[PDB]
């Protein structure tokens, strides 16, 4: 029901964030890519 | 003409940032160092 990121060797999920991820290129390149709402921890801290 | 940071074993350049570089000391102690702009993502993000 919800996507997470975990270390490969012991199941301990976390929210998918721009601190837990990095970017290259665009979605039409990766074969088997998926849609997901990636948290940017700066946006609440700019708005509030 | 421009300076990039890239992974050692496959050329894939990135504009040099505070997310890709760490800091120590000052520019006098290093040998063969050069001047270039470091992109700080936070200045556009605060000013937006
Ligand atoms: C991820 O979401 C995007 C939209 O944000 C999907 O893009 C659609 O792709 C279909 C097939 O070509 C088009 O008919 C739609 O018009 C597109 N939507 C928009 C808003 O442009 C994309 O297909 C989704 N990918 C996955 C794997 O779910
Ligand atoms: C990302 C990716 O490779 N997805 C494929 C999918 O397209 C295919 O229909 C399925 C069965 O062959 O195997 C998987
Ligand atoms: C590299 O070697 C040249 C001599 O060929 C010297 O002039 C230059 O200052 C050296 N640069 C660094 C970073 O060591």
Swiss-Prot record, chains A, B:
Changing residue 19 to H: In strain: Alpha/B.1.1.7. Glycans are attached at residue 35. Subunit of the fusion protein that is processed upon entry into the host cell. Mediates fusion of the virion and cellular membranes by functioning as a class I viral fusion protein. Contains a viral fusion peptide that is unmasked after S2 cleavage. This cleavage can occur at the cell membrane by host TMPRSS2 or during endocytosis by host CSTL. In either case, this triggers an extensive and irreversible conformational change that leads to fusion of the viral envelope with the cellular cytoplasmic membrane, releasing viral genomic RNA into the host cell cytoplasm. This is Spike protein S2'. It comes from Severe acute respiratory syndrome coronavirus 2 (2019-nCoV).
């Amino acid at each position: 029901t919800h996507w997470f990121v975990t270390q490969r060797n012991f199941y301990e999920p976390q929210i998918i964030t721009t601190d837990n991820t990095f970017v290259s290129g665009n979605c039409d390149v990766v074969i088997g890519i998926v849609n997901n709402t990636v948290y940017d921890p700066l946006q609440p801290e700019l708005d509030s």
